[PDB]
Every structure is written in structure tokens, then in C-alpha cells.
């Protein structure tokens, strides 16, 4: 009943810091502040709609990302929940460890279970980022006031370059989209204030784009009478795709495999390389800035200086240690040059595990969550035509 407003006094102030990070550094516009403030203030009326007698307000760290995702689709931005979980688990916008370092004066009177929720306790998993969006579009009506128009062209330009496929699949998918679609445009963002039950329809818009990217890449390769996509090129795709590299997208992707403990291909750190373990620890430098028996600890780090004792990478350093994301592809695309059945489809099945698990880590869902998304797209694409 009381100090629930004390949460509210800083749950905007942390969200003040989530967005001012995006504005000052990642070039996000000043209007993005104001788009979210309509999104911010309307849920306070929903709390004001709740009686103060036993209100039990429903705010979590999954909320402050979900209301930060809806401001990106009203502005029609190419930033997504793969471009949020890659900017939070890589310790870039303050999602993780928010209770402990952000207030600095408002901290102490907050109770113990409230201050527990406000820091970045876990990372969201298996549609927990999605079901809150379903609870966000429903509780405050982002529908019927705003535009819930997922710019899917701004989403699958990424998914071409994630795994280095030729750009025909950008339009091969598009006509699979434009065949099986109610209302050709506008994959619908879903709203739910109805009840607490996950409806097993997979009505999330960004969820269903991926199944269109899953069913296309099998159909354009298994049924190829045109012999334009040869098997030996597939043998030069997955062999060139299952290949580690040290770009900052890849290094940032390596952090994302770390954080999720439930699934396999999470104990993937054993296969790390020579260069990979340097910058992973230079990333770990950017965890301690988020994260009377005290001069002993000062005495401890006199014998472990964080820099190297000599020959560090400070000033007279290199030409380039690390290359950019436009240049690793110039080694990937300049590798699989050959371009012009039981064992053909198995070499397609190599990609079937590989690209659908690489997808599975990028968006924080389980394999059963993508099991629903194929069995309700493929069994719904057939029923429309048959």
C-alpha cells in the first residue's frame, strides 16, 4: 500500500537512464523520449484505476523492456528484442544491476523484496519478454491509438546478414508471407488484458516472422528442380557458417550463449579460441562498473593489477586487432564461391538444427515455443490452400 510509489519514483528514473543512454550514444531521437511518456503515464492511470486498498501493482524488469519495445514500433525502428537482449546482456543499457547503482539516495528506505525485483535479477526467457508485451498492448491500449505495424522489412534485412544467405530469400520469404496472410501488410501486434493465460495461437507478430524465415529456407532448397542451389554449395554454407569469429556482434553473441542456462549449446564456452578470451575479459571490465575489512581488499588488488604487468594494448598497439561487421562477411561471402535424394536433405538438415538454434538463442524462447510456431504456420498455410 505504501512504498509502491517509492518504486514508481525511480522505476521511471531507471527508465530515464535506459533511454538517455539510447539518445546520447546510439543516436536515438529526442522524440523517442516523448513517445514513451504517453506509454509511461497511461499505466499510472491503470494503477490509479486500481483501488489503493490492496492494489498489488504489476511491475517487473520485463515491463521496462516491453514498454521500451512498443515505443520502437510506433516510431517504426529496426531495433528489436534481438537488438535489445544484445544491448542488455552485453551490459549496455542498464537493465542488469539497476537497484544497486542507479538511485544513490532513494535506495535505503525501499524494502528487501522490492529492491530485489528492481535490479536485473535474471534475463527474460521463453516468451516472458513476449507475454509482457501481450500484457502491455492490452493493459494500455497501444492498439487503436498508435500504429502496431511491425516493419518486417526492417527485421529480415538483419536475418539475411546473420547467416550470410543470398538476397533472393528476402523476397522468396516475402511471397510466402504475401500468400499466407490475412490483410497482406501488417503482421499484427497482439494485445491481452483478458486474463493471465498464454493463448497457444502464437499471436506475437515478431514470433511469426521467424517461422516464415524457417519454412522458406527449406522450401527453396528441398524442392529445387532448377538446380540453381547445388548441394556442394550447401556443403560450403554450413561449413562456412559453423565457424567462429571475433567481431563485436559475434563477441556480443557469445555473451548471449552464456546467460541462458536451461538449454544445451550453452556450455559452448569450451570451444573458445585464442583471441576470444581477451575481449571477453575486456567486456568483463564493463560488468564491475555496473556491479574496516576494506583496506585488505585494497591490499588484494595491489598484487592483481587489472592491466597486464607489461606489454598491454594501450597506446603503441596495432593496426587493427578486431575487424568490422562489413568485413567478416567479405571473408564469408568470398569463401563459398561454388554456385553453378537422401543425402541432399540431410545436408539441408545440418542447417535445420543450426539456423533454428542460432535463431532460438537470439530471441529468448525454447524449442517448444518454436514448435508451436511451425505447427501453426505450416498447418495453417496448408488449410488455406487446401
Amino acid at each position: 500500500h505504501e512504498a509502491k510509489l517509492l518504486f514508481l519514483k525511480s522505476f521511471q528514473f531507471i527508465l530515464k537512464r535506459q533511454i538517455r543512454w539510447l539518445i546520447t550514444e546510439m543516436r536515438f531521437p529526442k522524440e523517442f523520449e516523448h513517445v514513451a511518456k504517453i506509454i509511461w503515464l497511461k499505466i499510472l492511470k491503470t494503477i490509479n484505476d486500481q483501488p489503493q486498498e490492496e492494489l498489488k501493482l504489476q511491475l517487473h524488469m520485463t515491463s521496462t523492456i516491453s514498454i521500451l519495445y512498443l515505443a520502437s514500433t510506433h516510431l517504426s525502428l529496426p531495433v528489436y528484442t534481438c537488438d535489445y537482449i544484445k544491448w542488455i546482456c552485453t551490459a549496455k543499457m542498464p537493465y542488469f544491476q539497476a537497484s544497486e547503482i542507479l538511485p544513490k539516495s532513494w535506495r535505503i528506505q525501499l524494502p528487501n523484496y522490492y529492491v530485489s525485483i528492481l535490479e536485473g535479477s535474471i534475463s527474460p526467457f521463453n516468451g516472458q519478454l513476449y507475454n509482457k508485451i501481450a500484457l502491455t498492448c492490452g493493459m494500455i491500449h497501444f492498439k487503436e491509438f498508435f500504429n502496431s505495424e511491425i516493419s518486417c522489412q526492417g527485421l529480415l534485412l538483419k536475418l539475411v546478414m546473420q547467416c550470410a544467405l543470398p538476397p533472393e530469400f528476402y523476397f522468396y520469404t516475402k511471397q510466402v508471407i504475401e500468400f499466407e496472410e490475412t490483410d497482406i501488410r501488417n503482421l499484427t501486434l497482439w494485445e491481452r488484458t483478458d486474463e493471465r493465460h498464454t493463448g497457444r495461437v502464437s499471436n506475437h507478430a515478431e514470433l511469426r516472422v521467424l517461422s516464415y524465415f524457417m519454412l522458406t529456407i527449406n522450401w527453396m532448397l528441398s524442392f529445387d528442380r532448377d538446380r540453381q542451389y547445388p548441394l556442394k554449395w550447401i556443403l560450403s554454407l554450413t561449413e562456412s557458417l559453423t565457424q567462429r569469429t571475433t567481431t563485436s556482434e559475434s563477441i556480443g553473441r557469445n555473451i548471449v550463449k552464456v546467460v541462458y542456462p536451461d538449454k544445451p549449446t550453452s556450455s559452448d564456452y569450451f570451444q573458445w579460441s585464442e583471441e576470444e578470451t581477451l575481449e571477453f575479459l575486456k567486456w568483463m571490465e564493463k560488468q564491475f562498473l555496473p556491479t574496516d575489512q576494506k583496506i585488505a581488499r585494497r591490499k588484494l588488488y595491489k598484487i592483481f593489477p587489472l592491466d597486464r604487468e607489461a606489454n598491454h594494448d594501450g597506446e603503441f598497439n596495432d593496426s587493427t586487432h578486431q575487424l568490422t561487421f562489413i568485413e567478416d562477411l567479405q571473408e564469408r561471402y568470398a569463401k563459398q564461391t561454388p554456385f553453378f535424394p537422401p543425402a541432399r536433405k540431410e545436408a539441408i538438415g545440418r542447417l535445420l538444427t543450426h539456423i533454428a538454434s542460432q535463431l532460438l538463442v537470439d530471441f529468448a524462447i525454447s524449442k517448444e515455443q518454436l514448435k508451436d510456431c511451425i505447427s501453426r504456420i505450416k498447418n495453417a498455410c496448408l488449410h488455406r490452400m487446401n
Partner: protein, 610 residues
């Protein structure tokens, strides 16, 4: 003989030091520091293919399902012929059936006739018990444990004209006492859950338990793990569980408990090294090399190393390496759940003095998890060793020789159906894009032949004319519907939206589209400082966003140009958010809902605070 010991224990854990020094003044490293020095010693496989056939628990009453060691039969005793190499494992449907020759690596023999004997129960233990060196021969029999019986066979009369392995048998003694027996060792001496016995090994197959036994049933032992071994043949058995070791001389009334491991470690695995003095024990968190005492054959405990992993399903196998100066004893701890490995070195020298050198680890195969590693004696500073593995949920028993110098079944069941009816109904959608791509190999080619033309210079001024038309309508529709206090498409045209591809001039169409709207009621977003979300780099301009995506699909695209121009405009016509209501729309609306909230939430509704 080194100094810093106890007589009950002796430790050399991870990466600190020894605990001893003689101070020998002999100019030959004046120490007996219990870490010998050398260079590195890494291990590289020799991979081969040898032979082949609730999710949160596993059961301890299984031990193994394979054994293979050099053996000598009754036709090999009287003859000069010595050294026969077998292999036996459980396979089949229910695992209730049980079934050779190294040439340069170990391979199955060319006559390839495994004696696939059939039983009435799945197999839980397969062992051939090995030979004590005080007999000269190698024992020609095999011990197995089933769920329903206990069979003993006898490997009789291997052939060279047939390479056959025929057997005799013992009478399969069932469960008169109906409790699952755990460990048998010969060195029918068995260990049931809670008690052990001495059973009669027969010499007659053309046709039992001795009256001396004991019970070991710990009342607070919830697990189902046991283990028994003879201790240096002197009629003294070492009886185990996960918690304690019970030593029993069955020859006299002599019982004494030695290990007590309930507090912070528990016994996992215990492989009796073929050395009848030097024996190895593996609890969790520590490797113990507990040997035999030289004078009184009761129990020696010696130099021991901490086991750095912390797990709950630990196993070990140990393989002897005999060199001129010393003996080595590598210690292979494996686990049912993870794939990786960990190995030791113990320089067991002559005068009961030994050391260690360190620990190392190597890599594995991406399909399966290990359940049994099996060593090869190989008939007998470049350490060499050899072992054969058994994986759980992978039935490909391979081979390895370490020396110094995935389409899952959840993917074929979802795709590629074999219905003849809908074999082709999807195929029209397959030919839908076979139609529509070659429809668009020419519709884009309508634009390709035109290079800075004047009909497309006419169309661009026809295009931006039509942008100023429908926008200025809705700007007043936003102005007439201003006081709502309760959207951006730019896809309203339907002419082609596709008959013009000139990227460096299309931005100057859109700068002019921003120049034509300098006043309020309409604002826009940038296109040079917002396009970096695709590439995560500097996007200096719309002119050279194209030039690095032009060089991105050169070698994969046939004709390399038509696919690339049509995505860049497709981005702009889907990042077409040019229809924002200007600043007077949120200023009148943001405070409006905050005026609906009382003074309790006004101070809570405050940005620009610190």
C-alpha cells in the same frame, strides 16, 4: 622415502606444492619436491570405427556393458600359442543378448563371428575379471550380471581356422534371495544390496554359495551403490558404498572400517589397478592412489590429488604404463552427463616413493555422452596410451590412441511429408515463386535498361508531386481533429512504387520532401543517423549505405545488381515514418493524463531530475 606424510593420509592438491623435503645436498635438484619437472604433454587422438549394435535420474545398479582384455584359453595353455584379444558387449533389442584382432589398430576380426548368445534379462554388468600375476596365465572366463539371474561363462578354445569364441557356462544362479546383486569380482564372489557372499566357481558345465559371508547394510545408505575387490589376494575383501569402505578378511574374524566419507566427500568409483599393490580409489573432490602396505597387507594410503570438478555421476578408469625407470598411472575421470575428460600422472617408482606431474584434458565428439571408457594393455618423452569409449545414446564404440606428438530426430519428423495427395499442393506454391521471380527478373529489367533517363526524371517529379498531395490533406485532418486527448504509413500510392531505381537522387527527392515541410504540424526522422541499427557501424550517408551492401552480395548473386537496388528502397518504403504529429500534440497530451492523476503522482511523474 620422502618425509611429510601421515601414515593415514598424504596430499598433493591442485597447484600449491608438495608437503616434504629431505634436503639432500647432492647437487641434483637438492630436494624431493613431489612435483617432477618436464615440458608440456598434450594428447592427440587416433580416431577409428570399431563396432556397434527419468531424464533427471540414473540408476547406480548398472556398472558397465562391455569388457575386452587379452585372454588365454585351455587350448592356449598346453600349446605355445599365447595372446588372444577378445571383445564382448551387450546389444540387441532389449539388451538381453551378449556378443577381436589387432592388426595395426584394434579391429574386429575378418571371420567376424561374435557369439551372440541369448538370455532372458537385460545386462547390467559385463566384466572379464583379469589375472593375478601369481598364476602365469590369463583367466578364460567372463562374468555378467542380469536383472533376473547371474550367469558365468568360460571362453573356451578360440580358433585360427575359424576365429570362433565358443563358451561353456555355469548354472545361472537366480535370486533365491530376491535382491539385486551389484558387484562381482574374482581377481561367484558377489555383493548384493546390503550383504555379500562367496559362491562356487565351477569347473563342470555338464552338471553355489559358501557358508562364510557377511552383511554390510548401512541403515542410512539411501543410494544403491556397492563395490567389492580382493586386497592383494590375501583373502581380504574391500567392501564399498558411496560412504565408507569396509575391509573384511573372510579367512578369519577380521573386519575393520577405514574410510568414512559422509561429511564433505563421497565415494564414486574404485578401479583396482592390475598392480596387486598399487590400487586406486575415487571419491568426489579428490583422487586417491591408495596402495597396499609392504609388510602388513591391510591398507596403505599414499599420495593423492584433489579432483577439481564437482559432479554427482563420477566414474574413472585407470591404465598402467610401464617404462624403464618407473611406472605411470593415468587416471581418466569421466561422467555420464558431460563429454569432457581429465587425466593424471603418477610416477610409481620402486621404493614406495612416487610423485605427480600435473593434470590435462582433451576434446570429444559432438554426438552423445560417455558412459564407459575401456583400456588396452597393448601386449605389455612421448607417453603413449590407448582406450576405447562407449557413449550414452550413441551406439558407435570407437577407438582412441592418445600420444604426445547435427540434424536431430526432431527435425525429420516435422518437415518433408510423404503424402502423395499433398505432394504437389505445396508444389504449386513452389512454382508460384518459379512464376513470380522470373516475372520479376524482367519487371526489374524494365528499369535496368533505363540509365538516368528523362521519363524516370519525369516520374520522380511525378512521384514527389503525389507525396505533397495526400500528406497536406491529413495534416489538416490532424488539425481539425486536434482536441482528442485520448498513423504513419507512406504507402498510400499504388501506381507502381517500383519503376524508379536511382538511389543518389532519391535522397535529394526526400531532402526536398523535408524542405517542403519546414513549418510545424509535421516532423520526420533522420535517415543517416538511424540506419546504423542494421549494420552496427557508422552510416555516413544514404549514398554509401548502398556501396557496402552492393559489395555484400557480389559472389552469391547472379547479375549482382538487381537484387540489391530493390531492398534499399524497400527499407525506405518500410522505414517510411514521416508522419509524426509535431511537438504541440504530445505537450497537450502528456500532461493531460497526469492531470487525471492526483498530487500523489505528480512528483512521481517527473523527468529531468538528475
Amino acid at each position: 622415502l620422502g618425509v611429510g606424510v601421515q601414515g593415514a593420509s598424504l596430499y598433493c592438491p591442485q597447484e600449491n606444492y608438495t608437503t616434504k623435503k629431505q634436503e639432500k645436498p647432492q647437487w641434483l635438484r637438492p630436494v624431493d619436491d613431489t612435483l617432477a619437472e618436464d615440458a608440456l604433454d598434450l594428447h592427440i587422438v587416433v580416431k577409428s570405427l570399431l563396432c556397434d549394435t527419468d531424464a533427471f535420474f540414473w540408476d547406480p545398479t548398472v556398472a558397465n556393458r562391455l569388457d575386452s582384455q587379452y585372454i588365454q584359453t585351455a587350448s592356449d595353455l598346453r600349446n605355445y600359442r599365447d595372446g588372444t584379444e577378445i571383445i564382448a558387449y551387450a546389444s540387441g533389442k532389449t539388451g538381453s543378448v551378449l556378443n577381436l584382432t589387432r592388426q595395426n589398430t584394434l579391429h574386429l576380426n575378418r571371420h567376424n563371428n561374435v557369439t551372440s548368445i541369448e538370455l532372458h534379462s537385460p545386462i547390467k554388468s559385463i566384466k572379464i575379471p583379469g589375472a593375478s600375476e601369481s598364476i602365469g596365465r590369463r583367466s578364460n572366463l567372463v562374468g555378467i550380471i542380469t536383472e533376473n539371474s547371474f550367469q558365468i561363462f568360460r571362453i573356451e578354445s578360440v580358433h585360427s581356422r575359424s576365429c570362433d569364441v565358443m563358451v561353456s557356462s555355469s548354472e545361472p544362479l537366480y535370486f533365491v534371495e530376491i535382491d539385486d546383486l551389484q558387484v562381482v569380482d574374482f581377481a561367484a564372489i558377489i555383493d548384493i544390496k546390503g550383504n555379500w557372499s562367496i559362491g562356487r566357481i565351477p569347473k563342470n558345465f555338464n552338471n553355489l554359495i559358501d557358508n562364510l559371508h557377511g552383511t554390510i547394510f548401512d541403515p542410512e545408505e539411501l543410494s544403491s551403490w556397492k563395490r567389492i575387490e580382493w586386497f592383494s589376494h590375501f583373502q581380504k575383501i574391500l567392501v564399498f558404498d558411496r560412504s565408507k569402505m569396509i575391509e573384511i578378511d573372510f579367512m578369519n574374524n577380521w573386519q575393520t572400517e577405514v574410510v568414512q566419507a559422509k561429511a564433505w566427500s563421497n565415494i564414486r568409483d574404485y578401479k583396482r589397478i592390475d598392480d596387486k599393490n598399487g590400487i586406486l580409489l575415487t571419491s568426489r573432490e579428490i583422487i586417491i592412489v591408495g596402495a597396499s602396505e609392504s609388510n602388513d597387507p591391510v591398507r596403505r594410503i599414499s599420495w593423492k590429488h584433489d579432483l577439481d570438478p564437482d559432479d554427482t555421476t563420477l566414474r574413472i578408469t585407470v591404465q598402467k604404463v610401464k617404462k624403464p625407470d618407473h611406472i605411470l598411472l593415468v587416471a581418466f575421470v569421466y561422467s555420464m552427463r558431460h563429454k569432457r575428460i581429465y587425466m593424471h600422472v603418477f610416477s610409481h617408482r620402486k621404493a614406495n616413493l612416487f610423485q605427480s606431474l600435473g593434470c590435462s584434458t582433451v576434446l570429444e565428439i559432438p554426438g552423445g555422452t560417455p558412459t564407459g571408457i575401456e583400456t588396452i594393455l597393448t601386449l605389455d618423452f612421448e607417453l603413449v596410451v590407448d582406450f576405447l569409449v562407449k557413449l550414452r545414446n550413441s551406439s558407435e564404440v570407437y577407438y582412441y590412441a592418445l600420444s604426445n606428438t547435427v540434424d536431430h530426430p526432431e527435425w525429420a519428423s516435422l518437415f518433408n511429408n510423404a503424402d502423395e495427395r499433398e505432394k504437389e499442393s505445396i508444389g504449386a506454391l513452389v512454382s508460384q515463386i518459379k512464376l513470380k521471380e522470373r516475372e520479376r527478373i524482367s519487371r526489374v529489367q524494365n528499369l535496368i535498361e533505363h540509365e538516368n533517363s528523362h521519363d524516370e526524371d519525369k516520374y520522380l517529379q511525378d512521384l514527389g508531386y503525389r507525396l505533397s498531395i495526400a500528406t497536406n490533406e491529413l495534416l489538416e485532418s490532424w488539425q481539425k481533429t486536434k482536441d482528442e486527448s485520448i498513423h504513419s504509413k507512406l504507402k498510400n500510392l499504388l501506381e507502381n512504387s517500383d519503376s524508379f531505381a536511382s538511389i543518389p537522387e532519391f535522397s535529394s527527392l526526400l531532402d526536398q520532401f523535408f524542405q517542403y515541410y519546414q513549418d510545424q504540424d509535421v516532423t520526420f526522422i533522420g535517415f543517416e543517423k538511424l540506419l546504423h541499427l542494421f549494420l552496427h557501424e557508422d552510416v555516413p550517408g544514404l549514398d554509401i549505405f548502398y556501396n557496402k551492401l552492393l559489395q555484400c552480395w557480389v559472389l552469391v548473386s547472379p547479375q549482382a545488381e538487381l537484387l540489391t537496388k530493390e531492398i534499399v528502397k524497400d527499407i525506405i518504403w518500410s522505414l517510411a515514418r514521416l508522419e509524426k504529429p509535431s511537438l504541440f500534440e504530445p505537450i497537450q497530451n502528456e500532461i493531460s493524463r497526469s492531470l487525471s492523476g492526483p498530487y500523489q503522482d505528480i512528483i512521481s511523474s517527473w523527468d529531468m531530475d538528475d
